[PDB]
Write an enzyme that holds these catalytic residues in place. Structure first.
Site, PDB file in Angstrom:
ATOM      1  N   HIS A  64     -67.233   4.294 -19.956  1.00  0.00           N
ATOM      2  CA  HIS A  64     -68.254   3.958 -20.947  1.00  0.00           C
ATOM      3  C   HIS A  64     -67.651   3.539 -22.275  1.00  0.00           C
ATOM      4  CE1 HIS A  64     -70.829   7.016 -18.587  1.00  0.00           C
ATOM      5  NE2 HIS A  64     -71.190   5.805 -18.210  1.00  0.00           N
TER       6      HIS A  64
ATOM      7  N   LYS B 175     -86.076  16.409 -17.021  1.00  0.00           N
ATOM      8  CA  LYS B 175     -84.903  17.051 -16.435  1.00  0.00           C
ATOM      9  C   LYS B 175     -83.751  17.138 -17.431  1.00  0.00           C
TER      10      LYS B 175
ATOM     11  N   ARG C 130     -69.264  -1.792 -11.798  1.00  0.00           N
ATOM     12  CA  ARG C 130     -68.070  -1.563 -10.986  1.00  0.00           C
ATOM     13  C   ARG C 130     -68.079  -2.367  -9.686  1.00  0.00           C
ATOM     14  NH1 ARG C 130     -67.630   4.268  -9.769  1.00  0.00           N
ATOM     15  NH2 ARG C 130     -69.905   4.510  -9.931  1.00  0.00           N
TER      16      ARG C 130
ATOM     17  N   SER D 116     -69.933   9.686 -14.568  1.00  0.00           N
ATOM     18  CA  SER D 116     -70.305  11.000 -15.092  1.00  0.00           C
ATOM     19  C   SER D 116     -70.568  11.985 -13.960  1.00  0.00           C
ATOM     20  CB  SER D 116     -71.541  10.898 -15.994  1.00  0.00           C
ATOM     21  OG  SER D 116     -71.271  10.052 -17.098  1.00  0.00           O
TER      22      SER D 116
END
Ligand SMILES: O=C(O)[C@@H](O)c1cccc(Oc2ccccc2)c1
Ligand SMILES: O=C(O)[C@@H](O)c1cccc(Oc2ccccc2)c1
Ligand SMILES: O=C(O)[C@@H](O)c1cccc(Oc2ccccc2)c1
Ligand SMILES: O=C(O)[C@@H](O)c1cccc(Oc2ccccc2)c1
Lengths: 157, 157, 156, 156, 157, 157
Positions: E17, E41, E90, E127
């Site tokens: 990032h 969440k 990616r 992540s």
């Protein structure tokens, strides 16, 4: 006892290929690098040049040797008493194409193919792209072994 | 002494998995099938049931053994003096997700991953799809080892 | 009720993968036309390619074989149809064929239906079969029995 | 001559992408059945989903809409058919659907024909449309006019 | 005048990032990192923790700022007088999925999306995978900025 | 002062290309469209013809200019004081090949690449397919700028 063949045109060998060789040599008792030559189209480097560049950059892999061939890869593999191929892959696209060839090779000769994921750092180097970039003057010194880079520039000049 | 670990949940083992086991056992001196114990999401078969189904299906593979495993896969691998994983692949999409995992595993522990292409006949079988089809009465007997199929019908009653 | 589709290709030579697609198209459409491209460097002549397909499709009463040139959509429309049926092996195949399918729909209103390869033929293609046979590999399980001997002839 | 296909989905709600596929299936097969999955957490009830599709397909005389449960191939075979027609947007879609298509052919001899999405609907899905509408985005150009007001109702 | 928004959950921010942030900040007059929060969440890190970890590792990018938000990304973008999103990618699989969202965002709000190819070295970090590996004790110190790594281990312990 | 180069052969420019030009010109202070001169494989239109077709189609873009280029793209970019390339993408496969090139260009010259997703309506148009369809009499007028279409018919007579 165990062994694998690492095939390619290696015109020239790249650091991505060398990574694959090292990883194969770590997991199999013997590894043969098969320099596959098209008798109908010359590459940039002759067969002896390709082999010399690979030998110079694999001198510290005692269980690896380098041989040329042509025709069906599975014949090269079987005539050495082996039945495994090891190949590097960069993308899903690579996998789909190589998949076809691996299944055909298994079908016609019983030879298995093991694929290994490229090291991240070399994921964008290919022999063809390195040659193309170098042809127009781009700096590819970090993508090729020392045994290759200046010989490539020499060919181009 | 070469070796590799073949990891998975195998809930239950399919003929696709068995094909991978056979090809790994043919090329490495030792293969360990690692059956995941997952504390959270439980499946249809207990770990012991899954191990027994694999042992029955791999009875002709003397250099392959089956064990349960938990946690970080590369710890499992290194604890057994090995540093190679072997996994089967069906699609390009599979390769992309597995490539991330393979690069991560090589980075954090120096453990390499070899992928093998599915046999064509099993390109569409998975543990999850086999269970789903069988749940609603579809016949998946040509896609599973004989013993698995008998046990699967038992769980469904 | 006058349903129909065209199955296009060079078919040089037709494989069991192609034949599987023909059979599946013939089972779902009233009329199937196999369109053999004239694009003059192949191994077999257009007539030879047509003959091999006719030989292999004798049990398909609603299928015929014709040669064609130029825009596929003109071939399809001049026969009163507006569907193409094509076999697909991979997602890469789908993306390339997708472009052509959307172009064909745009210019002529001709639709394209894709069918997934039979698993057993996922790795066979005319080009790979020819290449392997050329170096002595056995491809007899991948080609119609008739085609196989014809191929042996071209090489020997 | 008794050709037919089934177009399956949850259709929660049906989009213009789905309707495009229905229209294309209806143009190429004598009989089309849209199969609406009962899989009880969606936004619309199975009855509501069926109604929205029937409303949007009034101009398709050879199409009907039915709910279904369990194995899709049983739904298809119990209606005397053996073809499924499914729309596809991406190569990723093709690879996932390929597995299901090959499984369905294996267990029941039911074939699957895929059609490429219309370019204009390449980005619409039931899930993304619901998500965007939920946060106030305008999706009226992506849904049948009837569906759109019904969706506004569920949210407001 | 020119500007772009770099969105994500950044739970936690990774070196992948940060690479994207730096590349965006080099090509646009202002860059806003949008930390998008799901009010339904909780992630591993609170919003203030996520923002703090990003600020600490972007201190040398004078034209970058960090703000949180929720709901439609295009509203966040437009309310700041901008109409470009910059996102890292990616794989081809990434591109197909992100493509759908980019075309929807253009459709509903006229907002453009620019994608940038991941740096090779970080091509396998995410992540989620960093959290998963760290959860089971794997070494992820080289994949995360200093502002993240020990805070992550702290959360896990 | 921000800027980017939009490279290609544009033989001829399509509405897909124009969409990319417009989106780049909206987000960068300066855009240079670089029209490749290729010594080997010639195309349907001369470089001057291609430049004129682009200039006519981009008349409303004051911060975009059109120039011919040869050789290494990153040299072209850096010579003009820029270090960003903008390209349109249609598919996942496109992304994979372009990603290799983008990583190579960043490695050899520090030049970054931003990709934008095709507008849905032009996902299937390309210069090559448009020419092929037009050659055999298909109507591609909705896929090309008005002027291109007139010139294209001229070349075909
Ligand atoms: O079913 C699968 O493929 C996954 O659940 C999966 C992936 C990777 C490894 C797995 O098995 C183990 C992990 C850690 C230790 C032992 C075994 C399972
Ligand atoms: O082998 C292939 O798949 C391609 O070569 C191909 C693609 C599309 C159509 C093709 O055959 C025809 C083209 C035009 C008119 C009639 C037939 C061939
Ligand atoms: O929305 C989708 O695409 C999936 O949810 C899906 C896939 C396949 C079939 C589906 O609908 C039926 C399943 C079984 C019987 C009848 C209908 C739904
Ligand atoms: O049509 C294409 O996309 C390719 O031919 C291509 C790829 C990359 C750059 C290209 O144009 C230039 C390269 C170097 C200098 C100036 C322009 C063209």
């Amino acid at each position: 006892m165990t062994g694998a063949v690492c095939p390619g045109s290696f015109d020239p060998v790249t650091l991505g290929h060398l990574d694959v060789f090292e990883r194969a040599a770590a997991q199999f008792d013997e590894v043969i690098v098969a320099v596959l030559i098209n008798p109908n189209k010359a590459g940039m480097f002759t067969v002896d040049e390709r082999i010399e560049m690979i030998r110079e950059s694999t001198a510290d892999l005692p269980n690896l040797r380098v041989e040329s061939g042509q025709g069906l890869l599975v014949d090269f593999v079987r005539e050495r008493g082996l039945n495994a191929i090891v190949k590097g892959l960069r993308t899903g696209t690579d996998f789909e194409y190589e998949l076809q060839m691996a299944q055909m090779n298994k079908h016609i000769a019983g030879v298995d193919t093991f694929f290994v994921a490229t090291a991240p750092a070399y994921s964008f180097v290919s022999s063809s792209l390195a040659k193309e970039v170098a042809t127009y003057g781009g700096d590819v010194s970090a993508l090729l072994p020392a045994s290759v880079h200046q010989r490539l520039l020499g060919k181009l000049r």
